[PDB]
A paper describes a structure:
Chondroitinase ABC I (cABC-I) is the enzyme which cleaves the β-1,4 glycosidic linkage of chondroitin sulfate (CS) by β-elimination. A 997-amino acid residue monomeric protein, cABC-I, is an endolytic enzyme with broad reactivity to CS isomers as substrates. CS is a sulfated polysaccharide composed of repeating of D-glucuronic acid (GlcA) and N-acetyl galactosamine (GalNAc) with a β1–3 linkage. Recently, cABC-I was used to treat lumbar disc herniation.
The structures of ligand-free cABC-I and cABC-I in complex with disaccharides (ΔDi-4S, ΔDi-6S or ΔDi-0S), the final product of the enzymatic reaction, have been determined at 1.88 Å, 1.80 Å, 1.92 Å and 2.50 Å resolutions, respectively. The overall structures of cABC-I bound to these disaccharides were almost identical to those of the unbound form (Cα r.m.s.d.: cABC-I-ΔDi-4S complex, 0.131 Å; cABC-I-ΔDi-6S complex, 0.161 Å; cABC-I-ΔDi-0S complex, 0.217 Å), indicating that cABC-I was not conformationally changed by interaction with disaccharides. However, the crystal structure of cABC-I in complex with its substrates has never been determined.
Residue numbers in the entry: 25 to 137, 140 to 164, 188 to 270, 273 to 985, 990 to 1021
Write the structure that this text describes.
């Protein structure tokens, strides 16, 4: 506390704190005749002393402090977010008081003299009080008096007060509690309950106790976001440093606990040097509860009975300190927003310490406390299934903590009702198709957070959701098979689109830091072993592959011999993110577009700044293993030249998102994505359309870009390429990778190139091989540049300069000012000798493929190596073709004429929804030439032709095997 008034314009944001750790500590204080003010060092919040206020009923004391109380607007302008001036203090009751403390604000007040508020005193322990001076009183610029009036209807009493504070606080976070009413309330959990109820039986009680044990097993036998500490010496050293002591007639003394979010009320960056030194003695709750958990784990594993006893007493003393500090039912502590970050490992510690809390008579208090602070999470914790229940962050950060809370419920029948309802809630959350872009699993196996397919969020959710199902397995609380089935689909999908990292195009806002299935490995075992007929051989075989375990190792893990999964082969369509995956030997190709329903990129204030082209019809080739080792190196990476994309090469200042904070740029139409045929062949259709009027986006930049993927190869074609500037700087990237001692070689037309720097220009009939063994045969292009060069770039978070040496090749479209085009072919198993053979086949009247149409309405590609035809209907159209005659919606159709059968697949990659609406099926009428007979696709001969009726739901392809009619 200074001589300056509260909210002094020298620094509005500099808190005035009465902590009493200064010279002449009661200077600013006066009492009426019926109050006595002391310093007591027996408990405190900040510094080592608090104010002991002895009083007769109706008596007052006064703080003499001038307040220049700012408007919310002024507070807000000073801080930079919505703010209010707050009055806050801590008080301790050794005994409950049946009445109210009145806090009054005025000018030159005495016991007998504007606005004020009430604090109910019917509690024991520390409580915090915090009110908006502008918004929570029942204030003119002359206020200099804060009067504390003991209740009138109570003959006498005693209250300890510390850390009386005037500060600027976030206007969201003065919360109402059992002591103080504010304008803000987080209402208490009201648990849903499912009928019929399971009875308390020995069986149902044993199952509850097995689920608790199984949770204990997971936490004592590595968790992300858990700072594990197994050295007892260290746990004891950290504990002693808390300086906790039991006091005589109840409570503790020790270092004050505060959450990472609660500190905001002090404005720590603006504290005077005196206060900050004291504030620096606080303990952050996250660290404290992590310690409580690490102690609980050691206690469980401890074989020495003396060390075990000590670890228990340390845990119970930390629990006692935590409760006495006011982390109890009905104590808001002004706010506990983002509660999970401070408490997740407290929840879990209570499972390990459940019998110790029972014996110490602490279970009910710790249950009431955790349930109270859990009210922040009411939307999930009430356990009523809703459109929002499939939240992937919940599955990651809260789902096990939720179960732990329910398992801590003291009544047996209520605990069974809660866990039964939880089983139903998780089954619904894992089964339902959330409407619009709401979080959760999808029917193509994508898994959405931030309104799109998002591996970075789904991967941790898969791990913990699998673990939950496994914790509940083979009990009356087991998750329904519908939830198990849907999660299997999402997890098998993730195995398909990862190798073992997701491609650049699936990296979300973290390009070059893709999530890895290696982080999800244990979820494959959990889900495998929690099958209705365990183990699921598919999931088990994936677990072994991803974890690098042998067939020999399988019998002990799964209880039967299982061959580790070989890498998946063929083509898989995932229109949930407007992508598809082509797999051949150890390579995966991520083909990715975007549309109205699929954002191109997530770009934040300090993430993915240069990500504009993340989804620009990219076709990133990844062999099994580290992408960095394959030359996907952030440093010096040309963000313009994402593999397979058609882009405008821009300076980074212009490629950078035009929003300083968040942009998730969606496309201009529903249609773009992939389709599949026979699980083996794929096609991408990408309609590249820019917004009419977004800064730095050329409104006339267009392309049509199709890819047909079969076996060891991909045929890439593009048409209708334009920009505002006659295709100046318009380019299609064949590849880009870093040059290293292991990635040092390019082949051009049978010549090894290792020089750095190197440039050349190629055209139709030329080929290359990159250092990753991909061959590129140029089949239509006037100018392809090849470069080995030093590149300067900037990193995607803070735009700081980077540099590196790269091999790349791109088509220069500036040679065709209007409706530029390209064609080229990739071989995934290229060698100089085989690329020589592919080039000869190309010169033999193009033995490789034929483009049957390439215009704004349709792209048609006959692959002569695979004998498959792909049809990208960018617009409904009648066409001339051997198989297909007409399609009445934008669609992707594929055909394969085997011996005596014609296989036809169709889809629209258009998911047919909005951010709000549920996806509904699109009916696609595909007319085919000739008379056919037979899958849920319907067919009807009509004249010399056959009408196929396809139902396209969430961009999920359908196919039908047709045989000819005489
Ligand atoms: Mg103090």
């Amino acid at each position: 506390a200074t001589s300056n008034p509260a909210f002094d314009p020298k620094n509005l944001m500099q808190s005035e704190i009465y902590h009493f750790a200064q010279n002449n500590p009661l200077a600013d204080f006066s009492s009426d005749k019926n109050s006595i003010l002391t310093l007591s060092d027996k408990r405190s919040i900040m510094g080592n002393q608090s104010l002991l206020w002895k009083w007769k009923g109706g008596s007052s004391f006064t703080l003499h402090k001038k307040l220049i109380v700012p408007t919310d607007k002024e507070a807000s302008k000073a801080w930079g977010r919505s703010s209010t001036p707050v009055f806050s203090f801590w008080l301790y009751n050794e005994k409950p008081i049946d009445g109210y403390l009145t806090i009054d604000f005025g000018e030159k007040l005495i016991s007998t003299s504007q606005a004020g508020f009430k604090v109910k005193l019917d509690f024991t322990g520390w409580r915090a009080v915090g009110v908006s001076l502008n918004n929570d009183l029942e204030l003119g610029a002359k206020v200099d008096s804060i009067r504390f009036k003991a209740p009138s209807n109570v003959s006498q009493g005693e209250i300890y007060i510390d850390r009386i504070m005037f500060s600027v606080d976030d206007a969201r976070y003065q919360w109402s509690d059992y002591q103080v009413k504010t304008r803000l309330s987080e209402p208490e959990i009201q648990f849903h309950n499912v009928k019929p109820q399971l009875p308390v039986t020995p069986e149902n009680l044993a199952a509850i106790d097995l689920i608790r044990q199984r949770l204990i097993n997971e936490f004592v036998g590595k968790e992300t976001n858990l700072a594990l500490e197994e050295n007892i010496s260290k746990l004891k050293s950290d504990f002693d440093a808390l300086n906790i002591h039991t006091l005589a007639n109840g409570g503790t003394q020790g270092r004050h606990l505060i959450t990472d979010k609660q500190i905001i009320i002090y404005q720590p960056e603006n504290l005077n040097s005196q206060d900050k030194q004291l504030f620096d003695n606080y303990v952050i709750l996250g660290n404290y509860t992590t310690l409580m958990f690490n102690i609980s784990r050691a206690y469980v594993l401890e074989k020495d009975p003396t060390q075990k006893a000590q670890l228990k007493q340390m845990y119970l003393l930390m629990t006692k300190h935590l409760l006495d500090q006011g982390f109890v039912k009905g104590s808001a502590l002004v706010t506990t927003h983002h509660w999970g970050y401070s408490s997740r490992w407290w929840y879990i510690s209570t499972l390990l310490m459940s019998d110790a809390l029972k014996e110490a008579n602490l279970q009910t208090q710790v249950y009431d406390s955790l349930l109270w602070y859990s009210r922040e999470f009411k939307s999930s914790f009430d356990m009523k299934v809703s459109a929002d229940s499939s939240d992937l962050d919940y599955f990651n950060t809260l789902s096990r903590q939720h179960l732990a809370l329910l398992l801590l419920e003291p009544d047996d029948q209520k605990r069974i009702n809660l866990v039964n309802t939880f089983s139903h809630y998780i089954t619904g959350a894992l089964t339902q198709v959330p409407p619009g872009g709401k979080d959760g699993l999808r029917p193509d196996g994508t898994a959405w957070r931030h309104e799109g397919n998002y591996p970075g969020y789904s991967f941790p959710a898969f791990k913990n959701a699998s673990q939950l199902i496994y914790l509940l397995r083979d009990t009356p609380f087991s998750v329904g098979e519908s939830g198990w089935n849907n999660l299997k689909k999402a997890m098998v999908s993730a195995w398909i689109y990862s190798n073992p990292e997701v491609g650049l195009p699936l990296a979300g806002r973290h390009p070059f830091n893709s999530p890895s299935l290696k982080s999800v490995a244990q979820g494959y075992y959990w889900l495998a072993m929690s099958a209705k007929s365990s183990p699921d051989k598919t999931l088990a075989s994936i677990y072994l592959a991803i974890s690098d375990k042998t067939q020999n190792e399988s019998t002990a893990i799964f209880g039967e011999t299982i061959t580790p999964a070989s890498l998946p082969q063929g083509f898989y369509a995932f229109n949930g993110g407007a992508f598809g995956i082509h797999r051949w030997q150890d390579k995966m190709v991520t083909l990715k577009a975007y549309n109205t329903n699929v954002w191109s990129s997530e770009i934040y204030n300090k993430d993915n700044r240069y990500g504009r082209y993340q989804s620009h019809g990219v076709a990133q080739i990844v062999s099994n293993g580290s992408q960095l080792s394959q030359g996907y190196q952030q440093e010096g990476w040309d963000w313009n030249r994402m593999q397979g994309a058609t882009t405008i090469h821009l300076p980074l200042k212009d490629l950078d998102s035009p929003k300083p904070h968040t942009l998730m740029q969606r496309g201009e139409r529903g249609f773009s994505g992939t389709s599949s045929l026979e699980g083996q062949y794929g096609m991408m259709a990408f309609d590249l359309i820019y917004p009419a009027n977004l800064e730095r986006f050329d409104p006339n930049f267009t392309a049509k870009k199709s890819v047909l993927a079969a076996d060891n190869h991909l045929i890439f074609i593009g048409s209708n390429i334009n920009s505002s500037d006659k295709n100046k700087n318009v380019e299609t990237t064949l590849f880009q990778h870093a040059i290293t001692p292991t990635l040092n070689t390019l082949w051009i037309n049978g010549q090894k190139i290792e020089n750095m720097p190197y440039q050349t220009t190629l055209q139709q009939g030329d080929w290359l091989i990159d250092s990753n063994g991909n061959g590129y045969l140029i089949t239509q292009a006037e100018k392809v540049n090849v470069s080995r060069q030093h590149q300067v770039s900037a990193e995607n978070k803070n735009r700081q300069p980077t540099e590196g040496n790269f091999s790349s090749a791109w088509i220069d479209h500036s040679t065709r000012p209007k409706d530029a085009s390209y064609e080229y072919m990739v071989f995934l198993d290229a060698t100089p000798e085989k690329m020589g053979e592919m080039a000869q086949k190309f010169r033999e009247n193009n033995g490789l493929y034929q483009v049957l149409r390439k215009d704004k309405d349709v792209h048609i590609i006959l692959d002569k190596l695979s004998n498959v035809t792909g049809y990208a209907f960018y617009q409904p159209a009648s066409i001339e073709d051997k198989w297909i005659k007409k399609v009445n919606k934008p669609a992707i159709v594929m055909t394969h004429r085997q011996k005596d059968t014609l296989i036809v697949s169709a889809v629209t990659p258009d998911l047919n929804m909005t951010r709000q609406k549920a996806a509904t099926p699109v009916t696609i009428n595909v007319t085919i030439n000739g008379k056919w007979q037979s899958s849920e696709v319907k067919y009807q001969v009509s004249g010399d032709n056959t009408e196929l009726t396809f139902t396209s739901y969430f961009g999920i392809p359908q196919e039908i095997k047709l045989s000819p009619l005489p």
